[PDB]
Each structure stands twice: as C-alpha cells, then as structure tokens.
C-alpha cells in the first residue's frame, strides 16, 4: 500500500549506498596481487580470451 513501498524504496537506496570496500579492492588492489602470485605457481595460467 504505502509504508511497505516507501520502506522498500529506502532499504534499496540504503543498500545502494552501503559503505563497501570490496568493489574498490577488485578495481585497484587485487589484480596487483594476482600478478604477483601468478609466476610463483606450479600450474601456469591458461586463458582463452
């Protein structure tokens, strides 16, 4: 009716605006770690595009 609708809107907007750090980590720290790890690895990478 009304209050469930507005509460769902607010829950969704708040969940959009959670203080999360995992996307920034995947954006700019974890590829450096994968590039450091990957030559010290017994099975080398094997990638199709």
């Amino acid at each position: 009716t009304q209050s469930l609708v507005s509460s769902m809107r607010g829950t969704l907007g708040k969940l959009k605006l959670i203080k999360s750090m995992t996307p920034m980590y995947l954006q700019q720290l974890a590829p450096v770690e994968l590039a450091v790890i990957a030559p010290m690895l017994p099975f080398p990478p094997f990638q199709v595009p």
Binding site: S3, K14, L29, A30
Partner: protein
C-alpha cells in the same frame, strides 16, 4: 587459501546488519524487508571461500 593470506581485505557481515538497523519498520505490517535480508544473506554452510 594463498590469496586469503595476502589480501588485506576482510569480510565483516556485521556491516550489513549495522547499516540495516537504521531502516524504519512498523511492527504492524507482515512483510519485513529488513529481516528478510538478514535471514537470507547468511550462506548455506557459512563458507566465504
């Protein structure tokens, strides 16, 4: 398990509960969009691997 020991990123699912506790829910209406999340987002065997 090698990436877990090099990643500075940690996983704290109390962040989602602490940011959940700001949404306003009436005790009246039967659907709780806040508590559905906290019942759902706990994974199956509670593994994060």
């Amino acid at each position: 398990v090698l990436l877990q020991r090099i990643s500075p990123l940690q996983i704290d699912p109390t962040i989602i509960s602490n940011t959940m506790s700001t949404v306003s829910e009436s005790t009246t209406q039967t659907l709780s969009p806040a508590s559905s999340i906290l019942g759902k987002l706990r994974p199956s065997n509670s593994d994060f691997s």
